[PDB]
Design a protein around this nucleic acid. Structure first.
Ligand SMILES: [Mn+2]
Ligand SMILES: [Mn+2]
Ligand SMILES: [Mn+2]
Ligand SMILES: [Mn+2]
Ligand SMILES: [Mn+2]
Lengths: 116, 115
DNA sequence: ACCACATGTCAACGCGTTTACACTTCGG
DNA sequence: CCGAAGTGTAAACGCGTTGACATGTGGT
């Protein structure tokens, strides 16, 4: 299963969900909150869960049960490949000269600093 | 703020800005590059409304190349939108040392492709 | 028991796309 | 001139969202 064949037709919402899960696996409403933080608005759970269900059916997300009212969503191996593939495309178009590159380098350096 | 523009746009539109972040191009050149990305035919009836909409949002400038050809380029605002989305994806991808070194090798390979 | 939490589900609604027809412009 | 290039554009159409109802769980 190639993640490219399955992840280039996803909507911005779905791709943002995968990026959130790229940080760490999360239960439903925790994803909602982090999406809400990115969008600056409220995200309707009636939109989240069906989109999580779609990503599951596409093979990009696994749905496990923490307790029998809570599910934990996480990226499959194909899901992580989808996140990597999207980043390699974004970068291949952004890294157009040396200034663009070092900009990315300081971004990644600052990100690694926040992790300590 | 760069976030407020980037968040709303659709995937199709951000792909337009990613394309333009590499280089300013004319309409059908954007079309062909997205057709290579999607691996599907891209309807021009879909592209031109989207580029124009991105102009009304102040993220793309529409200039005259010929009087049958337009050149589309990123405004400084559109660039900040591209950079902000890049920063968010990276902020959530660089979760440990291996993730960072993965991004470093990608960026290094990209830089070596420049010549 | 109480009442959050967590997720399920849907159809009226919103909205962008598809699929056309259409124009003016440049090359040979 | 004649065809392709390049872009314009609108209505049927497809298709995901909105905003709500809904169930069942876990905590206190
Ligand atoms: Mn979606
Ligand atoms: Mn909600
Ligand atoms: Mn990709
Ligand atoms: Mn093509
Ligand atoms: Mn076309």
């Amino acid at each position: 299963p190639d993640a490219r064949s399955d992840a280039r037709d996803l909507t911005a919402f779905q791709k943002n969900i995968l990026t959130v899960l790229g940080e760490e696996a999360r239960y439903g409403l925790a994803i909602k909150r982090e999406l809400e933080e990115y969008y600056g608005e409220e995200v309707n759970h009636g939109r989240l869960y069906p989109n999580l269900d779609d990503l599951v059916n596409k093979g990009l997300v696994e749905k496990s049960e923490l307790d029998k009212r809570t599910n934990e969503y996480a990226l499959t191996n194909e899901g992580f490949d989808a996140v990597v593939d999207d980043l390699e495309w974004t970068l291949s178009k952004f890294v157009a000269d040396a200034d663009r590159r070092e900009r990315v380098e300081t971004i990644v350096a600052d990100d690694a600093a926040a992790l300590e």
